[PDB]
Design an enzyme around this catalytic site. Structure first.
Site, PDB file in Angstrom:
ATOM      1  N   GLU A 168       1.141  -1.169  -0.047  1.00 33.78           N
ATOM      2  CA  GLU A 168      -0.216   0.046  -0.160  1.00 33.78           C
ATOM      3  C   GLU A 168       0.841   1.194   0.001  1.00 33.78           C
ATOM      4  O   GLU A 168       0.455   2.146   1.136  1.00 33.78           O
ATOM      5  CB  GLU A 168      -1.211  -0.170   0.871  1.00 33.78           C
ATOM      6  N   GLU A 309      -5.581  -7.386  -1.566  1.00 34.35           N
ATOM      7  CA  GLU A 309      -6.253  -7.582  -0.848  1.00 34.35           C
ATOM      8  C   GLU A 309      -8.012  -7.171  -0.637  1.00 34.35           C
ATOM      9  O   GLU A 309      -8.092  -6.455  -1.643  1.00 34.35           O
ATOM     10  CB  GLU A 309      -6.102  -6.578   0.714  1.00 34.35           C
TER      11      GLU A 309
END
Length: 377
Positions: A168, A309
């Protein structure tokens, strides 16, 4: 070419495992879960105060998953780091092992069960996800050198499929500042020190030199550049690691047969996005949003896209729209053949999404799981 006999590659949008001796190639699909904890102060996957580690992996396989995405932080991969919070009556064969050796044993056990492993350098420290792949005290060169070390050691495990380079990339200020202020990741801005597309090339080149048989998973950032983000009404509302809108004009410069784009995507439990409002068209507006943020990278540009995810509480002490959100995402993945994914998370101890296991660390959420199982068949 490969220290294990197996070489992984992408052909079009599908991942393949090649036996280099026999020449045989088999398409694989990743029906995956995240088992997190190595990137935290425990320095070990969580739950081992309540479960035996192998039984967990057996339970994972019994539910049809064939892949685990394994977050780690720097310290967990350095020899000598001690785990914290393991019940050793339940895990006697972990006695004496440091974090790294538990990681080896888990990956080897997963391999015995046919389970693929994606290594995910999730945090540089062990507390939180940095917006950038460097810090004031930890340089890019340090970051790369750790990957090289991880690649040298774990490249010898047949089932490790490759490297999710940085978890991320994101920003910690808003646009337009976030594009230039040096504090958050960009893509297509020009500055090679914030541009994640450029850095992904540097880091993946280094890993491919020591582990040429691996795949390089490259996630989105949060914002990319102002022209790209402004070109779409929901340009400024993609998730961390979730914005791949810049891939089209600013593709990562790595071999297409080694590259997988890996977006994260989340529902109302992570953030109450305006587009989750029925007044704004929810849930029927979603396919178009996923399509713009990441799905075109596969459906229009033909790259492999593996969602690294997604998850949420599925109506268990969360926003009940999450049920609707997860159904619609699973429908869309099935319609569009996004068949490779890692659900977040195996663990229940994820504060804004829960996981497949309930808080007892033993029993699954049958409904959340049954909905996901549609992807598995």
């Amino acid at each position: 070419q490969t220290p294990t006999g197996i070489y992984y590659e992408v052909r079009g949008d599908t991942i393949y495992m090649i036996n280099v001796t026999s020449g045989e190639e088999t398409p694989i699909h990743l029906f995956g879960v995240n088992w997190f904890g190595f990137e935290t102060p425990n320095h070990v996957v969580h739950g081992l105060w309540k479960r035996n580690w192998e039984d967990m992996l057996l339970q994972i396989k019994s539910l049809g998953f064939n892949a685990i995405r394994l977050p780690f932080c720097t310290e967990s991969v350095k020899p000598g780091t001690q785990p914290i919070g393991i019940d050793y009556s339940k895990n006697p064969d972990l006695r004496g092992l440091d974090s790294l050796q538990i990681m080896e044993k888990i990956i080897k056990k997963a391999g015995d069960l046919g389970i693929f492993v994606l290594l995910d350098y999730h945090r540089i420290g062990c507390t939180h996800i940095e917006p950038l792949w460097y810090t004031e005290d930890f340089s890019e060169e340090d970051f790369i050198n750790t990957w090289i070390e991880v690649a040298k050691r774990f490249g010898k495990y047949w089932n490790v499929i490759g490297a999710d380079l940085k978890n991320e990339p994101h920003s910690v200020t808003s646009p337009p500042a976030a594009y230039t202020d040096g504090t958050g990741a960009t893509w297509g801005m020009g500055n090679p020190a914030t541009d994640w597309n450029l850095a992904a090339e540097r880091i993946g080149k280094a890993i491919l030199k020591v582990a040429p048989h691996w795949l390089i998973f490259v996630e989105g950032t949060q914002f990319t550049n102002p022209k790209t983000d402004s070109s779409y009404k929901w340009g400024y509302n993609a998730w961390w690691g979730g914005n791949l809108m810049a891939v089209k004009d600013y593709p990562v410069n790595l071999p297409k047969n080694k590259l997988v784009y890996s977006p994260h995507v989340y529902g109302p439990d992570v953030y109450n996005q305006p587009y989750f409002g029925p007044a704004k068209g929810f849930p029927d507006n979603l396919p178009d949003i996923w399509y713009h943020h990441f799905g075109y990278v596969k459906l229009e540009l033909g790259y492999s896209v593996v969602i690294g995810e997604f998850g949420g509480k599925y109506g268990h002490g969360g926003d009940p729209r999450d049920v609707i959100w997860q159904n619609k995402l699973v429908d869309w993945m099935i319609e569009n053949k996004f068949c490779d994914f890692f659900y977040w998370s195996w663990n229940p101890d994820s504060g804004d999404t829960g996981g497949i296991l309930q808080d007892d660390w033993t029993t699954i959420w049958e409904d959340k799981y049954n909905n996901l199982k549609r992807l598995m068949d």
